[PDB]
Structures are given as C-alpha cells and as structure tokens.
Amino acid sequence: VSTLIPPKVVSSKNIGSAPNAKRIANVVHFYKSLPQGPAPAIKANTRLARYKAKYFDGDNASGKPLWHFALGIIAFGYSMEYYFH
Amino acid sequence: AKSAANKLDWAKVISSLRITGSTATQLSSFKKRNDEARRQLLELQSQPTEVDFSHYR
C-alpha cells in the first residue's frame, strides 16, 4: 500500500542480538588491561628479598632450596644430634 | 527519468543483501514498476483524443 521502511530500524535493534551481549562484555574487558607488561612489580623487597630473586622467584624452581635446607641440618651437627638427642 | 526511477532501485537490491525478507519494499518497487509499466503503454496507445473533422467526419 506504500513504501515499507525497515532499512533504518537498528537504533533499537542493536540490543537484543547475541553479538551485542558479547560486544558489551569484551569492550569492558579491554580498556583497563595493562598495555605492555606494565606494573609487573619485578622488584620484590620483603624480608629475605635476595631469596625472592634467586630461587623463590621460580625461574630455577629446582632442588637447591631443599639442598640449602639439608646443609642447614649438616651445619647443626653439634647442636641437635650432638650435645643433645 | 524512467531509467532514472529504477536506477536507484538497483541500489536497494544491493542494499537488500543485508536485509532479507523485505515484506513490501520490493512490493512497493513492484508497485512502482506495475503502474509505471502501465504508464508507457497508456501513452503509446494514446491516439490524439479527437475526431478528425477533416477526414474521419
């Protein structure tokens, strides 16, 4: 009876579609995300900070700390098993 | 004019790929072709609406 007009009705149509739900999701997931590894806090300073940078960081993550623990028992020979039970 | 009227109709068919299921826009284009086709035939078959007092009378 006349010229129908569904070419321009997306101003209220862009709310119910599924991609819009993902659209409003990931845009919030993007703006505050740190750009290039910023704010990594690589300078750890808490009590034994030196340990935090050699083995406690996790780059090595090997049996050295338990080796250090074992050597501590060895150095305590005349303190726990000798001169005492 | 006639070729210009449907020239922009070949624009909406390209616009129709993203908009599928147009109820009446194509019908309106069909209507604007149905009546327009009736126009050219009407004027070509239109004799000068008069009686020839010289010859035909």
A1 shares contact with chain B (CB less than 8 Å): yes
Strands (E), chain B: none
**Cα(A49)–Cα(A42) distance, integer angstroms:** 11
CA distances from A83 to A75, A77, A78, A79 (A): 14, 9, 6, 6
Question: Scanning every residue of chain A, which has its alpha carbon at the shortest distance from the alpha carbon of B25?
Answer: A4
Q: Looking at the complex, report in whole angstroms how far the Cα of residue B36 sits from the nearest Cα belonging to chain A.
A: 15
Structure tokens at B34: 């149905």
- Rounded to 10 degrees, the C-alpha dihedral B18/B23/B24/B29 comes to 50
Going from the C-alpha of A29 to that of each of A4, A25, A33, B6, B25, the distances in angstroms are: 40, 7, 7, 47, 41
CA distance linking residue A40 with residue B27, whole number of Å: 63
What resolution does the deposited structure have, in angstroms? 4.2
Residues B26, A20: Cα–Cα separation, whole Å: 29
Q: Which residues of B23-36 are buried (b: 16+ CB within 10 A; e: fewer)?
A: eebeebbeeeeeee
Nearest-5° Cα angle at B31, B30 to B32: 90
Closest CA in chain B for residue A1: B28
Quick check: A65 and A55 in contact, CB under 8 A?
yes
